[model samples]
Target: GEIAAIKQEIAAIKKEIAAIKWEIAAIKQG
Candidate 1:
């Protein structure tokens, strides 16, 4: 259960990072 929670945190952080990068890239082109 602990390991599962750790993985979930990592996935959430990765998702957040991806969204930030995507937003920046979209802005740079606009």
Candidate 2:
């Protein structure tokens, strides 16, 4: 049960990083 919870947390963190990278790219283009 603990391992499953940790994996979900990691997935969420990866999604957040991806969103941040997208924002940075948009700022660079503008």
Candidate 3:
């Protein structure tokens, strides 16, 4: 159960990073 929770946290962090990168690219273009 602990391992599963850690995996979920990592996945969430990765998703957040992806979103931040996308936003940065948009800001640069504008």
Misplaced by over 4 Å in model 3 are none
For model 1, the superposed segments whose C-alpha errors exceed 4 Å read: none
State TM-scores per candidate.
0.72, 0.85, 0.79
Provide the lowest-lDDT 10-residue window in model 3: 17-26
lDDT tens string, model 3, 1-30?
999999999999999999999999999999
- Tens-digit per-residue lDDT, 1-30, candidate 2: 999999999999999999999999999999
Error of 3 at 9 (Å): 0.6
Preferred candidate (lDDT higher): 1 or 2: 2
Q: List, residue by residue over 1-30, the lDDT tens digit for candidate 1.
A: 999999999999999999999999999999
Best by TM-score: 2
- Model 1, position 21, has a per-residue lDDT of 97
Please list the Cα RMSD from the true structure of every candidate, rounded to 1 decimal place. 1.0, 0.6, 0.7
Model 3 residue 18 CA deviation (Å) reads 0.2
State which candidate, 1 or 3, has the greater TM-score.
3
Off by over 4 Å in 2: none
TM-score of 3: 0.79
